From a paper:
Unlike the previous ligands, compound 1 does not contain an azole ring and instead elicits a type I heme shift suggestive of substrate-like ligand binding. This effectively ensures that the heme iron sixth ligand water is displaced, explaining the observed spectroscopic effect with HS heme iron formation. As observed for compound 7, the BC-loop region appears unperturbed by compound 1 binding. However, the putative dimer interface observed in the CYP126A1-compound 1 complex is distinct in nature. Although still composed of interactions between the FG- and BC-loop regions, the respective orientation of both monomers is altered. Thus, binding of compound 1 results in a 155-mV increase in the CYP126A1 midpoint potential, consistent with heme iron reduction being favored in a substrate-bound form of the P450 (42). No evidence of oxidation of either compound 1 or compound 2 (which both possess a terminal 4-nitrophenyl group) could be obtained in turnover studies, and it thus appears that these molecules “moonlight” as substrates but are not readily oxidized and instead act as P450 inhibitors. However, two of the HTS molecules (compounds 1 and 3) were calculated to bind twice per CYP126A1 monomer at 5:1 ligand/protein ratios.
However, CYP126A1 is highly conserved across pathogenic and non-pathogenic Mycobacterium species, suggesting an important evolutionary role for the protein. The CYP126A1 structures reveal a dynamic molecule, with the BC and FG regions clearly affected by ligand binding.
Residue numbers in the entry:
A (entry chain A): 7 to 176, 197 to 228, 238 to 412
B (entry chain B): 7 to 176, 198 to 228, 238 to 412
The structure:
Amino acid sequence: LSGIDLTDLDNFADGFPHHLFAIHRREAPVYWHRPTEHTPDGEGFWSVATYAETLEVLRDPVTYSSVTGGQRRFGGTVLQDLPVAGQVLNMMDDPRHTRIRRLVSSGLTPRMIRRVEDDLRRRARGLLDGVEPGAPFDFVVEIAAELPMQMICILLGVPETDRHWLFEAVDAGSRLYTYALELIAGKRAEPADDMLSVVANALSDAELYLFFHLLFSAGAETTRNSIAGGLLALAENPDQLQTLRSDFELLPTAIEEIVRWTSPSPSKRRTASRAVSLGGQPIEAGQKVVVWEGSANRDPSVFDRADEFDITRKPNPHLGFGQGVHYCLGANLARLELRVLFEELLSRFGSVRVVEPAEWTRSNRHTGIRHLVVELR
Amino acid sequence: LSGIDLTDLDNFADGFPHHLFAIHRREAPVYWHRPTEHTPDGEGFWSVATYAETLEVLRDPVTYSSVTGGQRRFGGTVLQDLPVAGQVLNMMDDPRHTRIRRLVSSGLTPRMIRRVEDDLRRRARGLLDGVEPGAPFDFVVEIAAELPMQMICILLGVPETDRHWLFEAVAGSRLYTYALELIAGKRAEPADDMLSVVANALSDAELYLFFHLLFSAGAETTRNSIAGGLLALAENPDQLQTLRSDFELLPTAIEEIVRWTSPSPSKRRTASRAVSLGGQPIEAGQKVVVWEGSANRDPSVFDRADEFDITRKPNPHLGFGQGVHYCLGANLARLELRVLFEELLSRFGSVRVVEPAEWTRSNRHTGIRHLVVELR
Ligand code: HEM
Ligand code: HEM
Ligand SMILES: COc1ccc(-c2noc(CN(C(=O)Cc3ccc([N+](=O)[O-])cc3)C(C)C)n2)cc1
Ligand SMILES: COc1ccc(-c2noc(CN(C(=O)Cc3ccc([N+](=O)[O-])cc3)C(C)C)n2)cc1
């Protein structure tokens, strides 16, 4: 570990570096990672690679705060300190966290979920009906990116007309900002039956924009990555692809294994609020703690054959949707996207070939695939 | 006017559309511009094109707020309502405006001004010495953008090794995350610069908005004054020759450059009460847009208003604002202009614009994106 820099994004340019996290779990489940020239804030942090310790952190939100601790002015849930801490739901603590979490969740009505689902089935069919069998195309740009973008546009009440223009936005920061502000003002003047309207008509003007941005570039991006990643895992494990396409009652379990395997959000930060021990190491109030769900999800202490993709895997207590009070509000929506996409795809196609090497997102906050060129037959 | 859409940015694609504002001043100095598909917030606004009325709005900050008014949640100083109203200096009212304005000006010390000048002379000379005489080149990217970006880097204490990289930011992410560490460093280790002064006195989120504002707007307005000044002087080779022969004409010439280019040609406010402007009834909460760019060619105030004249006197232009929000950086912008043109004119009596200027498509900035020139 003394020669390994988890903050050097060159180590994440080619996918989540599971080899380095096997070293981390063996050598030091919990350890103090000294800052390098790549480390945000120039500051060291406790790094946690094992499942037990990751879960222990997630399950104690008083000790390990999503806001700040000690004398640190602001923290948040990514490695760099951000003043958005306290101002967006994922970066709030009780009591306001609970109030906002429930407000957002009250937007996920049965009818909204049907509205999402009906659109998703229509779209996934149209997209898969338009694939020329055998012809190479970029699965990420043509399919994986589209479905979740439409899902969150529907959740947030983005007019169908604006959706592709809005996507180019994720002058880009500017377009996004000035568009969302108008969309938000519209829902206040004229309430509509969507999540943005629920929330806007209940957060400060500024916080409502940060909420919009978050769903829009975390909810869409993570789900897109699960889909692209799942297709890649299935191309690389073709006997499992055949087993799965023979028996769609295997999909619930296959989907949980896709999320475990891909871990689209593989890292999470907190800030200690008090002296505490974790993994036998003394943490002081104010110090940063980074947990790596991407590593925890391959911990051989918890998962048998952890480095193998197994669509029949049970049990599967993965941490790819988080755990505890901040658990993914979108977990059933991401599963829904995955289920429909793979039902429609695997129905038509039993052969999936990746014809160029996957290009990965250069990041340790996301594990994502920017381009995936495939042939489906 | 009913056929003219001031929110359609195609009308600004080839420069500030002075001819349209000539129609505006003649037909209705103050008028209700109805919303079109191009209008932010889909909401109408009063448009003010004459000097008298523009000055009247700028000089009454209580009636014409830079935050909001009526029942509008938020306004600010651009046409679109923005929630940064109340959070950045230019979009604050008293009592907090005065407090922050004074803090920001305490940052402008004689030594800082000297630090800027020293750097500016060396750089300007370095850049002008590097020009191939007769060779075409983009004056905007090569010279006019660099000098003010360095100025604001010095004001804000941006380390020299970071500056080129920071400028590429003006992604949104990189500017935000970089600025946050810079600000934190000055808190940890105070330095002799304006960012340090302001950070060690504003919320953590307001310090970012302050950094973004200076770093963006301060550099861009000044850049545009520099490039537009070159262009006006190339189109008036007569006065270029006179100016080149007598550098004690620079102070007066620079005020004419600012009047003429008016890099910040529009400003928004929000009425806070019922009031009359230009004989038209404005209600509390309504938007008022003033156009300094039109006001600065108003023939009731300026003789031969449509002519560029370096010897123009008097020159009560509104290119730096007026009243309580008056530009804090006016001397700095004048200093950039003075040094650049001194060093350039020293070396060069001939300025040819070889391709036609490419303008920024904007009614918030009047700016040149590209100006290919030959100096001899
Ligand atoms: C496969 C796709 C997804 C993954 C892997 C993912 C993962 C996560 C994780 C790990 C967290 C916990 C954050 C923490 O502990 O700080 C979380 C929270 C969150 N997720 Fe997801 N998510 C996905 C899709 C979605 C979607 C589609 C939505 C849209 C509703 C969404 C909405 C949220 C929200 C609002 C939270 C914050 C909840 C809170 O802090 O109380 N997620 N997600
Ligand atoms: C030629 C270039 C410049 C132009 C045309 C310009 C123009 C303006 C104008 C018209 C205003 C009035 C804003 C309003 O009424 O809402 C203003 C304000 C401002 N200017 Fe400049 N400016 C220039 C350069 C700079 C520079 C270099 C600085 C760097 C210190 C600067 C700092 C500011 C600040 C902080 C304000 C806000 C002051 C307040 O609201 O109290 N400006 N400027
Ligand atoms: C102001 O700059 C930022 C930077 C990062 C964030 C950020 N918030 O969470 C994360 C990491 N992350 C998660 O913690 C999972 C997640 C959070 C929220 C949602 N969502 O759709 O609302 C999905 C996934 C995702 C983006 C991989 N990053 C927010 C604001
Ligand atoms: C989207 O968020 C914002 C924030 C601020 C602005 C904004 N603030 O002022 C203006 C227009 N403007 C001015 O009013 C003049 C000005 C203000 C401040 C500075 N400065 O260096 O601090 C220079 C010029 C300039 C940029 C042409 N625009 C616009 C959008």
